[PDB]
Design a binder for this molecule. Structure first.
Ligand SMILES: CCOc1cc(C(=O)N2CCC(N3CCN(C)CC3)CC2)ccc1Nc1ncc2c(n1)N(C1CCCC1)c1ccccc1C(=O)N2C
Ligand SMILES: CCOc1cc(C(=O)N2CCC(N3CCN(C)CC3)CC2)ccc1Nc1ncc2c(n1)N(C1CCCC1)c1ccccc1C(=O)N2C
Ligand SMILES: CCOc1cc(C(=O)N2CCC(N3CCN(C)CC3)CC2)ccc1Nc1ncc2c(n1)N(C1CCCC1)c1ccccc1C(=O)N2C
Length: 127
């Protein structure tokens, strides 16, 4: 049918702060996941029209992708790291909800999720 608009990435009304955990999410976590061999399906919103997936946004009501996460980090959209971590987790969960277990895209998401969790384990202390 029609794609929804992409998620909001800037909000001038939200308060802003720069923290070492948010800097780490952008400069280490997002950077490492972006370069992974399986990252390319997750680098932009699902274009359900072009990909012939008419029921995608009937099922997935909280879409998320790493292009949006990158922009949110750049625009200081997040006040804390947990908000950004939730967005990565939403991205993976959407893939698991929509696709059959064991599909190619699920294996790709599972590999990215494993790497993501390894990097979140090394999240620096707030300081
Ligand atoms: C920016 C580029 O975008 C994409 C491009 C191409 C592409 O090169 N061609 C080539 C082969 C084509 N033929 C048609 C006949 N056919 C039986 C075989 C394939 C299709 C179009 C494919 C998928 C893309 N983009 C995507 N974005 C999120 C997802 C996503 N694909 N996959 C795929 C990525 C690789 C494995 C699955 C999903 C596919 C279906 C449902 C959900 C999801 C999903 O969850 N995600 C996250
Ligand atoms: C947009 C759709 O995308 C793909 C679809 C399918 C597919 O049949 N499903 C998967 C989705 C299934 N749903 C899941 C949700 N549920 C509710 C309903 C059921 C239905 C059927 C397979 C591969 C895809 N996407 C792809 N994108 C680039 C590549 C690519 N496949 N191929 C294959 C395309 C055909 C030959 C090989 C590659 C495979 C391995 C390595 C590289 C490449 C490669 O080079 N390219 C360019
Ligand atoms: C070197 C092996 O290679 C692959 C193997 C297999 C595989 O299990 N077979 C196939 C061979 C079978 N023999 C052959 C004859 N013999 C006598 C008996 C056994 C056994 C079973 C699947 C995909 C492969 N190769 C791949 N190359 C890039 C990509 C890629 N798969 N994935 C998948 C890998 C895991 C996650 C998804 C992609 C899939 C769809 C779209 C894009 C991409 C993508 O982005 N990349 C980077």
């Amino acid at each position: 049918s029609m794609n929804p608009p992409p998620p909001e990435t800037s909000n001038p009304n939200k308060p802003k702060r720069q923290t070492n955990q948010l800097q780490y999410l952008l400069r280490v976590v997002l950077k490492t996941l972006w370069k992974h061999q399986f990252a390319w399906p997750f680098q932009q919103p699902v274009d359900a029209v072009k990909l012939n997936l008419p029921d995608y946004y009937k099922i997935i009501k909280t879409p998320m992708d790493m292009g949006t996460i990158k922009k949110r980090l750049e625009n200081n959209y997040y006040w804390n790291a947990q908000e950004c971590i939730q967005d990565f987790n939403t991205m993976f969960t959407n893939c698991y909800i929509y696709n059959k277990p064991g599909d190619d895209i699920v294996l790709m998401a599972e590999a990215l999720e494993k790497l993501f969790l390894q990097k979140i384990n090394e999240l620096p202390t707030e300081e």
